[PDB]
Design a protein around this ligand. Structure first.
Ligand SMILES: C[C@]12CC[C@@H]3c4ccc(O[C@@H]5O[C@H](C(=O)O)[C@@H](O)[C@H](O)[C@H]5O)cc4CC[C@H]3[C@@H]1CCC2=O
Length: 544
């Protein structure tokens, strides 16, 4: 009765939190077309969240275990809603839009408060759900909660896409005078409406926790016992080894997921939409289904702790074994003159021989920086039409065709990177299928992980363990994994882009072989380390 009510309230809170994070991610990304934002501002916006969450996660998890957990969760939800509403404050204060000073403080404070209020949700909520539920149903409840958490960001991104379709000043200025269209690239959307909706939903999600009981059928002592509790948690070998296992596995998973869309873009030549669509709307449902399936399997067969560890190890092994198969599914580099091939059509050229300037385009004073893709009738892609030796351009229908191009004749061409011919879409189909299966298999061992985490510690330290677990994920896996993955990937960049100010943008073209090698190898190595640690965990469990 009351347990189901708490489960529903926690699921709604998880949905609201994930919707807020997904909307933030979608809006920041989609605002790029009009407002050229420095890479520092987006980084600081994300990092204020991290500081706010990490500074209080441990204290809330520990000092809130014996307090009124539902009321602390409700207060955290209220703080999250207040921060989300504060994020949208600058809209009401800035002047009407017409087509970094004293205005981003609102955004930073709103994100800081949101990160602070996010902390009591997972540790205290999961501990409360586990304490008063039967041993069989705890896994199922945690599985449902984590499935909702995984699903949420899809709804957040959908809300972001819906809001970006509306004009920024809707309600403030009559839309009849507005003559601009979203296709016109001076358009900016109503980013504040989604933040207001997310804040309202987060505030409404805190209502049920005021009526939930403290338990189902002082601070000085906590301060004194904090250190012995930490020693007991780290004195437990199962907990420490599973913490290391999860840290390494999430180091692998965050790196794989973060740069998966870019890997698809560069390896298989797919468009920007084609990759984000198959990642957000295909792999995330697979992850959610894997989590739910793991929870259902744990509940139905009454799998014990040893069985949970065995399932974790098996899921990890059978996921990374399938991920190893992605090495075979690789397309070769597209024929690009001056970077991968020379203007004479020679097969791969070394580093020292990069001949962006050639004899055929010698009469052409071209700029090195711009990247406008085009390929001629010979099937060789060129950096831009200027370096192709083209003299005249004709606009036919929706396309532009360049004539009298000297380099290709060594003479017509089309704009954009024309497709890879030697069966690359066929390989892309198998890559997509194997990636979906790998994501499902790897996410299958998610709830057995939590069961292993909760069934091998003394109960009065469940909350203070879970928070540490979360603190372990963000400090060691959530934050670092994108950084060095991106660095090692960018070591394989052949041509860099630039922004309107001069700082280098995202790399426009990578070497397919080195990119695939690094991206798959790092993930597989981290997965192998995680598998070894899981084997150690299973052996220690069998010993005890
Ligand atoms: C970032 C954001 C979209 C853009 C919003 C914005 C956009 C512009 C802005 O002011 C302008 O910023 C420029 C910049 O960008 O450098 C500076 O050059 C200008 O001098 C400054 O007048 C302030 C804000 C505050 C809220 C921001 C939103 C919060 C959530 C979101 O998605």
């Amino acid at each position: 009765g009351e347990l189901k009510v708490f489960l529903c309230a926690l699921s709604f809170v998880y949905f609201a939190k994930a919707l807020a994070e997904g909307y933030l991610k979608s809006t920041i990304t989609q605002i790029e077309r009009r407002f050229d934002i420095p890479s520092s501002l987006v980084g600081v916006i994300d990092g204020s969240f991290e500081i706010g969450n990490l500074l209080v996660i441990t204290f809330v998890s520990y000092f809130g275990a014996k307090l009124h957990r539902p009321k602390i969760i409700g207060a955290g939800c209220v703080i999250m809603g207040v921060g989300t509403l504060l994020i949208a404050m600058p809209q009401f204060f800035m002047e009407q839009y017409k087509y970094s000073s004293s205005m981003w403080i609102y955004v930073f404070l709103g994100n800081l408060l949101r990160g602070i209020g996010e902390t009591p949700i997972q540790p205290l909520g999961i501990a409360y759900l586990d304490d008063f539920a039967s041993e069989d149903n705890a896994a199922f409840y945690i599985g449902c909660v984590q499935t909702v958490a995984i699903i949420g960001p899809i709804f957040g991104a959908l809300l972001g896409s819906l809001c970006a379709k509306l004009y920024v000043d809707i309600g403030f200025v009559n839309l009849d005078h507005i003559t601009i269209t979203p296709k016109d690239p001076q358009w900016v959307g109503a980013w504040w409406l989604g933040y207001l909706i997310a804040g309202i939903i987060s505030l409404l999600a805190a209502v049920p926790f005021w009526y939930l009981p403290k338990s189902l059928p002082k601070i000085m002592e906590m301060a004194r016992d904090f250190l012995p509790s930490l020693k007991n948690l780290f004195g437990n070998p199962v907990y420490f080894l599973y913490l290391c296992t999860s840290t390494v596995q999430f180091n692998s998973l965050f790196g794989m997921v973060t740069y998966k869309p870019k890997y698809i873009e560069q390896q298989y030549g797919q468009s920007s939409s084609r990759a984000n669509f198959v990642i957000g709307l295909i792999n995330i449902p697979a992850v959610a289904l894997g989590i739910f399936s793991g929870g259902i399997v744990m509940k139905k067969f009454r799998i014990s702790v040893c069985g949970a560890a065995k399932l974790y190890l098996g899921s990890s092994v059978f996921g990374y074994l399938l991920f190893l198969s992605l090495f075979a599914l690789g397309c070769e580099n597209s024929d690009v003159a001056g970077l991968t091939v020379s203007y004479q059509g020679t097969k791969p050229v070394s580093y020292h021989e990069r001949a962006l300037f050639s004899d055929c385009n010698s009469r052409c004073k071209c700029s090195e920086t711009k990247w406008e893709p085009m390929c001629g009738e010979n099937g060789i892609t060129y950096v831009s039409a200027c370096l192709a030796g083209c003299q005249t351009s004709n606009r036919s229908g929706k396309n532009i065709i360049f004539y009298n191009c000297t380099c290709v004749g060594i003479s017509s061409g089309i704009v954009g990177r024309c497709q890879k011919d030697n069966g690359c879409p066929q390989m892309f189909l198998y890559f997509l299928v194997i990636s979906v299966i790998t994501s499902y298999t790897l996410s299958l061992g998610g709830i057995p992980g939590y069961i292993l985490l909760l069934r091998c510690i003394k109960p009065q330290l469940k909350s203070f363990a879970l928070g540490i677990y979360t603190l372990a994920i963000r400090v060691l896996a959530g934050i670092p994994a994108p950084v060095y993955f991106g660095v090692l990937i960018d070591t394989s960049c052949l041509k860099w882009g630039f922004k309107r100010c001069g700082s280098r943008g995202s790399c426009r073209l990578y070497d397919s072989n080195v990119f695939r090698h690094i991206y798959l190898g790092l993930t597989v190595i981290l997965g192998t380390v995680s598998i070894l640690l899981s084997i150690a965990v299973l052996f220690i469990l069998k010993k005890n």
